[PDB]
C-alpha cells in the first residue's frame, strides 16, 4: 500500500477489506449537520510531563514517538471515558497548499493535518487496545499556511536527518503543548485509523481552530522521501486519504 496510482487508497480494500467498513475515517464535517451536544465535557490534555524519544520515517510519514510506560502525557474528559496515553504524533500533507488534510470542513481542505494518537490505558498496551471499539483516541488539528509556528521549528530542523524510509533520530525534550491551538473546541465521531490496518477503533476529536505554520515550514515536509536510501527518489507528498461515507454516524459538536 501507498498513495501512488497503483497502490493508492482506492486499492487498499483488496488487502484490507475493512476499507469498505461502516465506521471508516476520514470524513467530511458538515458544520450545519453536526449536532451541538451539551452533555460534552471540556477536553483535558495533560502533556506537561511528556517524554519524546525519537523521530522516524516509516515510508508513509514521520512519527515522533513518546514513552507510554507511564501516564506522562494523557488525554481525558470530553467524549472519552477513562485515560488515554499519547504514543505518537505525525502529519499528513499535500503537494500544494490547497490539499493535505484528511478531514474536511464543509468540504474545505487544509494544508496539512496533525494526528496525536492515544490508547485507552484500561487495555494495558497499544496492541490490545486496537482490538477494542473504544481502544484509541486521536486528536486531530488542521494546519493552515500563514505565520511560522515557533513550537514546530524543532521538528522541521531534524527532517534532513530522516529523509528516507527507515531512518530514525533521537528526539528528546520535545513539548507537544507547542502544537496546540488556543481553543479546545471540537467535533467528535466514531471512526478508524486513516491508514492500513484501518482498524475501526478510534474516537475522533477534531479541533475547530486550526494552527498556522509558515510556507517554509510546510515546504520542508515535502522534501521527505517515501523511498529508502539508494532507491529512485519519490517525494513524500499527498499522504492523505479521501473522505469516506459517514453512513448513519452522527457528528457531535462541543460548541
Q: Which does 201 bind (CB under 5 to 8 A by kind): Zn ion, Hg ion, none?
A: Hg ion
Nearest distance from residue 90's CB to Zn ion, in Å? 6
CB 118 within 8 A of CB 137: yes
Q: Is 32 in the active site?
A: no
92 marked as part of a ligand binding site: yes
Q: Which does 43 bind (CB under 5 to 8 A by kind): Zn ion, Hg ion, none?
A: none
Nearest distance from residue 200's CB to Hg ion, in Å? 5
Extract the C-alpha cell encoding 43: 477536553
Nearest distance from residue 128's CB to Hg ion, in Å? 10
CB 118 within 8 A of CB 68: no
| Distance of alpha carbon 83 from alpha carbon 118, whole angstroms | 9
| Distance of alpha carbon 129 from alpha carbon 172, whole angstroms | 26
> Under the criterion CB under 5 A, does residue 155 sit at the interface with Hg ion?
no
Please, what's the b/e burial string for 28-43 (b: 16 or more CB within 10 A of its CB; e: otherwise)? Answer: bbeeeebeeeeebeeb
Strand 52-57 versus strand 62-66 pairing type:
antiparallel
Site for Hg ion in 192-221 (CB under 5 A): 199, 201
CB 179 within 8 A of CB 114: yes
The binding site for Zn ion (CB under 5 A) comprises 115, 194
Nearest distance from residue 136's CB to Hg ion, in Å? 8
Q: How many helices (H) and strands (E) does the chain have?
A: 3, 15
194 marked as part of a ligand binding site: yes
Q: Which of 13, 60, 103, 118 is catalytic?
A: 60
Query: Which residues are documented as binding site for substrate?
Result: 194-195
Query: Which residues are documented as binding site?
Result: 90, 92, 115, 194-195
Query: Which residues are documented as binding site for Zn(2+)?
Result: 90, 92, 115
Active-site annotation, residues = 60
Residues that bind Hg ion (CB under 5 A): 199, 201
Amino acid at each position: 500500500w501507498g498513495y501512488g496510482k497503483h497502490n493508492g487508497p482506492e486499492h487498499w480494500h483488496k488487502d484490507f477489506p475493512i476499507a469498505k467498513g461502516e465506521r471508516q475515517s476520514p470524513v467530511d464535517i458538515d458544520t450545519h449537520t453536526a449536532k451541538y451536544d451539551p452533555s460534552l465535557k471540556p477536553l483535558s490534555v495533560s502533556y506537561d510531563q511528556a517524554t519524546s524519544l525519537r523521530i522516524l520515517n516509516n515510508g508513509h510519514a514521520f512519527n515522533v514517538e513518546f514513552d507510554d510506560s507511564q501516564d506522562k502525557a494523557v488525554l481525558k474528559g470530553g467524549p472519552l471515558d477513562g485515560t488515554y496515553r499519547l504514543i505518537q504524533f505525525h502529519f499528513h500533507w499535500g503537494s500544494l497548499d490547497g490539499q493535505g488534510s484528511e478531514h474536511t470542513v464543509d468540504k474545505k481542505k487544509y494544508a496539512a493535518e496533525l494526528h496525536l494518537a492515544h490508547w485507552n490505558t484500561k487495555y494495558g498496551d497499544f496492541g490490545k487496545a486496537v482490538q477494542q471499539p473504544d481502544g484509541l483516541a486521536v486528536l486531530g488539528i488542521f494546519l493552515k499556511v500563514g505565520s511560522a509556528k515557533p513550537g514546530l521549528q524543532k521538528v522541521v530542523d531534524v527532517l534532513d536527518s530522516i529523509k528516507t524510509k527507515g531512518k530514525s533520530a533521537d528526539f528528546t525534550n520535545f513539548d507537544p503543548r507547542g502544537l496546540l491551538p488556543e481553543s479546545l473546541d471540537y467535533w467528535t465521531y466514531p471512526g478508524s485509523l486513516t491508514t492500513p490496518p484501518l482498524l475501526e477503533c478510534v474516537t475522533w476529536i477534531v479541533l475547530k481552530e486550526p494552527i498556522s505554520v509558515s510556507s517554509e515550514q510546510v515546504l520542508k515536509f515535502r522534501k521527505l522521501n517515501f523511498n529508502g536510501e539508494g532507491e529512485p527518489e519519490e517525494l513524500m507528498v499527498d499522504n492523505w486519504r479521501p473522505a469516506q461515507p459517514l453512513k448513519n454516524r452522527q457528528i457531535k459538536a462541543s460548541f
